[PDB]
Design a binder for these strands. Structure first.
Ligand SMILES: [Mn+2]
Ligand SMILES: [Mn+2]
Ligand SMILES: [Mn+2]
Ligand SMILES: [Mn+2]
Ligand SMILES: [Mn+2]
Ligand SMILES: [Mn+2]
Ligand SMILES: [N+]
Ligand SMILES: [N+]
Ligand SMILES: [Zn+2]
Ligand SMILES: [Zn+2]
Lengths: 184, 368, 368, 184
DNA sequence: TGCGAAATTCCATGACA
DNA sequence: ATTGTCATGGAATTTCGCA
DNA sequence: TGCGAAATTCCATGACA
DNA sequence: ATTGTCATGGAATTTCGCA
């Protein structure tokens, strides 16, 4: 078998609904399997059309051989199937209720969910503007298993934004009490 | 004047006036018999006025002014007096064209890494497509890899919105642009300082300086035109296709596509190159590091036979930017304060402000 | 196709496919092991489609299209098939630029006599001066002697009014102009036929062809600009001064003013030349006849290293005159009917009309 | 003494009033002394200002050393004197009631007056348009004394409009009777 | 150790402003 | 305080296939 | 049959479209 | 059925003034 490469496989999923931010409610999440590189796209719905609209942006930069997803409605529609067939992208579904990705991908999704919740607090409504910085953080985060960040693996260089202060990622005392206050 | 000319009539020798010719008085004026004919020798005190009257008929240069004068007069070293006046005639100095070419172009080093330097610029206005009129083009200097954004205006605000999307991927050390309103605004400056991005500006009115992106505009427009043949110019929906198409096109001189230069491996697009299928990613990234360093780099071309290079303290003139009808194409003379490189200078524009300026928008002032 | 490729798998020799390489079957396709790697050999019947798909990604030329194909395939003489398709791709043919220069310019003979040929043209619009916006410029081809008329429009009617005044002096054999609306109208044609004047037109969109007068426009504007420095652009009252000033200015290469070339003697203007004071008029006219014939005439410059010259029956393309945004800069290919001279041709514009056209507005169609 | 030259001397005079033609009533007449070359300018009055306006056109082509005229008001005004002084043109007046020019010039003026009257008949009103052709005729007319036309002497070449049919110039029977009819 | 043809490299030309 | 660039397709040069 | 300086000629550069 | 041109000012080359 040939070694794993960037663009071999993109793992996609929806997160949300979230509180409204500049009209957006969801985040489509794309993680390259080999590098762990993440792209995020705000959407108004977890629909096929929001998915296609977002993936059209990404697939103007790079096209994956395989897209992997759960069996969400957005990804199993025949429109989404027609879309992938048109681009020579093979679709791949985890069996229902049994999400399988990979260790590296699993951890990344955990990081994403946790990192979002962290800053989604105190400013539940301003996350749209924060998506850029969230991605830079996620992509310039050192990988314990590999000696390298996703940025390094994707581009083959150091980046001009290393996130040297590997952050807490856990919720402080004021945030737990005001996350229990917002969800009241 | 009357003093110098007197010693001459009595037949004694003055430096400048050849002794082998005969000088006489006639009709109240000192004359001389020269091969071409008999010419009047005016007194030195009359000569500036004469050169001036001859020059002023049509504001002629050296020879054409001389030829008028030589019709009536002779004196020593006439051209020297002609040239003295040309060098002081404001109207000629700011209206005439140059006849010296710029020194040969620089070929700045290719940025060493992707994201070291971005070149940005606007194309448009274009026939309206979905309400959009412009395209922001962002070109990575090392790779050529290019991003395209449709906008409604070439504004700061639309620049910022698109760059926020692009910088999601990576932040660049430097962003180079021309002195367009969108890029020189204080809002855009804050936006860059906020992010550790250094703004680099072209000298004014010198798009060769943004050559990397200007040249990419040509490819963008050329492909858009081809895809739109015999259809209405609905370009909005094709930006994404064109972006992908160009990022995956080979440069014959490099033997690489910009995509390859950025990632060291083709993605799932037609005719993907497969040579590194058996290498590990790490082996691939190591071969890419080697590929990046050994790319062909052009060398500075030969000077043309009549070029000038700037020298500190030289009088030079900046080209007028948008000269009105029937107005001079050149500013008043100004002085070279510093030679930044042989193609770029700081001048004191005699107001006097410091301006950094390309020699392509300069002529050397004539007649010293 | 399947026939030709079969004889190959069994190890027998086909012309084109080198015998020293080993050809096998795998994954349902004929393959070959080449230095660069293992490539698929498509059947001849698949090859046009492949070249086409590769070319169509970004409508790339020879090498950049080849490099895509060579990623997956090998077959004999691939570039030959690539070039076959480029030569048939309408979109590339009418959008790409030329990379061959025009042959070296002609230097037509100077008209032998004053009044043999006039070159006429309009300057403007100019900032309004006394309600006037344009200048008619009429240049005598032999002498350079120039007449100036202010007009409200570049119209036939204003042309006729000024030429009636000028032709009071003398009628010219020929009047040369560009294809401006003022000169191509049937009214202007009648006006010329009425007088025994032959109309000669430049090829379209080629002002080099009216070079004599275009060049004079430069001097006219340049002197007007100088005289108007730091004053409002009230040019109307200066036309007469400029006309006189330029007609009496020396050309350094000729050593004569246009006035001198027309009359063989200066009039009462400053610095009048006096060399023929002792000759009779008739002696003067005889020396002028001799001066007229021996004027310097420039010779055709060297061809550039990569020029083309038109050949009868060649496919060539005319440049689109005023191409819209995102539209091709070239017309569909057309055929050279006649080579009038090495810089001028008649083409069948495949509608098909006969057009007489400068090679500067032509490219030779690529890939034969 | 040096031989006579074109531009040595221009002889000017007014002819008129004439019947109105496109608003014009007079003709300023300029004849170069050496060549016999004629220029004609329509004016609305025999005034200094009409003279200056017309001579400004001519003197944009060529400047005479001397202008000769009778002592008409237009030519003796101090404005006209200032005008000539400005251009280095010396003015020259014939003594009152004794017009003297030269044989060549005298004959030319006769030709002009006669040629005008000839075509001024039958169309007393359309002479404005005819001034160009009148001048070409006058200037491509052979000079008995010299072997040459004014055109030939001025430009040193043959012209493209030779007036080979040296014309009658006298008034026919129909014209005499209709000149006696117009002047009724 | 050399030949004819094919492949590759060279590079002037022009277009982005 | 900064700086030209590079797709294109004939021609020139190099390499390949074969002896 | 020669030298230093002045005069003249050469000619690339750019601007008219 | 038509076609580049020529002012400009440094440099290159020729001529002049003198022995
Ligand atoms: Mn899901
Ligand atoms: Mn720009
Ligand atoms: Mn024109
Ligand atoms: Mn009178
Ligand atoms: Mn631009
Ligand atoms: Mn023009
Ligand atoms: N550099
Ligand atoms: N010719
Ligand atoms: Zn001047
Ligand atoms: Zn094409």
């Amino acid at each position: 078998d040939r070694p794993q490469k960037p663009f071999d496989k993109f793992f996609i999923d929806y997160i949300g609904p979230l509180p409204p931010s500049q009209g957006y409610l969801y985040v489509l999440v794309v993680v390259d399997g080999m590098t762990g590189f993440t792209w995020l796209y705000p959407t108004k719905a977890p629909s096929t059309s929001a998915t296609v609209k977002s993936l059209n942006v990404l697939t103007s930069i790079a096209i994956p051989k395989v897209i992997h997803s759960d069996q969400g409605a957005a990804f199993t529609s025949s429109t989404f199937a027609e879309w992938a067939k048109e681009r020579g992208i093979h679709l791949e579904f985890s069996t229902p209720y049994h999400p399988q990705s990979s260790g590296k991908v699993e951890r990344k999704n955990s990081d994403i969910k946790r990192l979002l919740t962290k800053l989604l607090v105190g400013r539940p409504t301003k996350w749209y503007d924060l998506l850029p910085v969230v991605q830079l953080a996620l992509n310039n985060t050192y990988s314990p298993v590999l000696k390298y960040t996703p940025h390094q693996l994707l581009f083959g260089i150091d980046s001009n934004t290393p996130f040297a202060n590997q952050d807490t990622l856990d919720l402080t005392r004021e945030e737990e009490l005001s996350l229990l206050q917002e969800i009241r | 004047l009357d003093a110098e000319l007197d010693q001459l009539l009595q037949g004694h020798y003055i430096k400048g006036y050849p002794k082998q010719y005969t000088y006489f008085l006639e009709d109240g004026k000192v004359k001389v018999s020269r091969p071409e004919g008999v010419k009047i020798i005016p007194p030195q005190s009359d000569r500036q006025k004469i050169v001036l009257q001859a020059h002023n008929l049509a504001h002629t240069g050296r020879e054409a002014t001389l030829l008028k004068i030589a019709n009536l007069y002779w004196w020593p070293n006439m051209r020297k007096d002609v040239v003295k006046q040309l060098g002081r005639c404001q109207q000629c100095l700011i209206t005439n064209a140059s006849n010296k070419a710029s020194g040969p172009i620089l070929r700045p080093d290719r940025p060493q890494k992707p994201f070291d330097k971005f070149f940005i610029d606007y194309i448009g206005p274009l026939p309206p497509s979905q309400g959009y009129l412009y395209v922001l083009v962002v070109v990575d200097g090392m790779t050529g890899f290019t991003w395209l954004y449709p906008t409604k205006a070439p504004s700061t605000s639309a620049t910022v919105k698109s760059l926020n999307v692009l910088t999601s991927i990576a932040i660049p050390k430097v962003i180079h642009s021309d002195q367009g309103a969108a890029f020189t605004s204080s809002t855009f400056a804050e936006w860059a300082k906020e992010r550790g991005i250094h703004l680099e500006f072209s000298t004014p009115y010198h798009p060769q300086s943004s050559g990397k992106v200007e040249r990419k505009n040509s490819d963008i427009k050329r492909l858009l035109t081809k895809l739109l043949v015999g259809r209405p110019t609905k370009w909005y929906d094709l930006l994404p296709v064109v972006q992908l198409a160009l990022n995956n096109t080979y440069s014959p001189v490099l033997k690489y596509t910009p995509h390859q230069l950025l990632f060291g491996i083709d993605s799932n697009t037609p005719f993907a190159n497969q040579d590194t299928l058996d290498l590990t990613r790490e082996e691939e990234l190591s071969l890419l590091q080697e590929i990046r360093t050994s790319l062909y780099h052009p060398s500075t071309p030969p000077a043309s036979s009549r070029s000038w290079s700037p020298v500190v303290g030289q009088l030079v003139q900046e080209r007028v930017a948008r000269p009105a009808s029937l107005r001079p194409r050149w500013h008043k003379p100004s002085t070279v304060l510093k030679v930044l490189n042989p193609r770029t200078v700081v001048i004191l524009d005699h107001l006097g402000n410091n301006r950094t300026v390309s020699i392509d928008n300069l002529k050397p002032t004539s007649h010293q």
